[PDB]
């Protein structure tokens, strides 16, 4: 679905014909007068007097104000109510094309005796940045692929796997930007969902044992809108 500010906001806002004489808590003008936003998106945009009720919570704003607020964020397809902090829509990312594969291997991770291991492989080729990327039309590099990572095959690890698959489909596992490890720009980097790439030790900090990891990555997934 379109992630553009006007389309996203219009998707979740229900028109109010007779708004009350109360403050829009985005622009702090009354809902019965024009939006206080005067930036570039007002020109030939949403009529400034239009007011809507947002999503399930029903909080009311000038439509133009929520368009501006959404535009000043990540524009990831999710829309947060500034009053009650409920989030509407599905957060998706800018991960480029590639493949995600997984299967079981007959080896136990440190701290998970008597288990098999879910081995996940991500493979992302180089390509051309799209309009969603920092430098559209410029090449992006993809270093160190295929990238292997590991989860124990237990109840919680399988839950994490299910959610990682969802995050992958929502283009949230990788992004295009600058590597904090190499300094290279215009390159495919891990996003904000940590993966364990070191199997039998934790000298890198990205390995095992780590008794907190599964709960930590579940929290990271929830923060990116990926929950069960």
Ligand X SMILES: NC(=O)c1ccc[n+]([C@@H]2O[C@H](COP(=O)([O-])OP(=O)(O)OC[C@H]3O[C@@H](n4cnc5c(N)ncnc54)[C@H](O)[C@@H]3O)[C@@H](O)[C@H]2O)c1
Query: Considering only residues 7, 14, 38, 57, which one is a binding residue for Zn ion as defined by CB under 5 A?
Result: 57
Q: Give the integer Cα–Cα distance in Å for 53 and 163.
A: 31
**Which residue, 61 or 174, is less far from ligand X as judged by CB?**
174
Which residue from 149, 177, 170 is spatially nearest to 161, judged by alpha carbons? 149
Q: Nearest-5° angle of CA 60, CA 63, CA 65?
A: 90
Give which of Zn ion, ligand X, none residue 35 binds (C-beta under 5 to 8 Å, depending on kind).
Answer: Zn ion
Q: Give the integer Cα–Cα distance in Å for 79 and 61.
A: 13
* Region 179-218 residues binding ligand X, contact defined as CB under 6 A: 179-182, 189-190, 194-195, 197, 204, 206
Q: How far is the CB of 144 from ligand X (least distance, A)?
A: 3
**Which residue, 39 or 136, is less far from Zn ion as judged by CB?**
39
Q: Nearest-5° angle of CA 43, CA 44, CA 49?
A: 85
Residue 227 touches ligand X, criterion: CB under 6 A = no
Which residue from 176, 165, 3 is spatially nearest to 95, judged by alpha carbons? 176
Query: Considering only residues 50, 60, 69, 81, which one is a binding residue for Zn ion as defined by CB under 5 A?
Result: 81
Site size toward ligand X, by CB under 6 A: 13
Q: Give the integer Cα–Cα distance in Å for 218 and 101.
A: 20
Query: Considering only residues 8, 13, 35, 171, which one is a binding residue for Zn ion as defined by CB under 5 A?
Result: 35
Binding footprint of ligand X on the chain (CB under 6 A): 143-144, 179-182, 189-190, 194-195, 197, 204, 206
């Amino acid at each position: 679905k379109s992630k553009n500010p006007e389309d996203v906001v219009r998707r979740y806002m229900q028109k109010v014909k007779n708004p009350p004489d109360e403050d829009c808590t985005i622009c702090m003008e009354r809902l019965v007068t024009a939006s206080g936003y005067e930036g570039v998106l007002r020109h030939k945009g949403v009529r400034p007097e239009l007011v809507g009720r947002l999503g399930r919570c029903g909080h009311m704003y000038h439509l133009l104000c929520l368009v501006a607020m959404y535009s000043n964020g990540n524009k990831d397809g999710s829309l947060q109510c500034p009053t009650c902090k409920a989030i509407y829509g599905e957060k998706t990312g800018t991960q480029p094309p590639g493949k995600m594969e997984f299967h079981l291997i007959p080896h136990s991770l440190p701290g998970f005796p008597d288990t098999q291991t879910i081995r996940i492989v991500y493979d992302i080729p180089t390509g051309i940045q799209g309009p969603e990327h920092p430098n559209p039309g410029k090449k992006f590099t993809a270093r160190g692929f295929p990238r292997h990572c590991y989860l124990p095959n237990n109840e919680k690890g399988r839950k994490v796997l299910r959610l990682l698959i969802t995050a992958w489909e929502r283009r949230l596992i990788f992004t295009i930007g600058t590597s904090n490890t190499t300094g290279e720009s215009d390159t495919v980097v891990w996003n904000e969902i940590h993966h364990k790439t070191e199997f039998g030790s934790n000298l890198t900090g990205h390995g095992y044992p780590d008794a907190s990891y599964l709960d930590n990555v579940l929290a990271e997934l929830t923060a990116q809108g990926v929950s069960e």
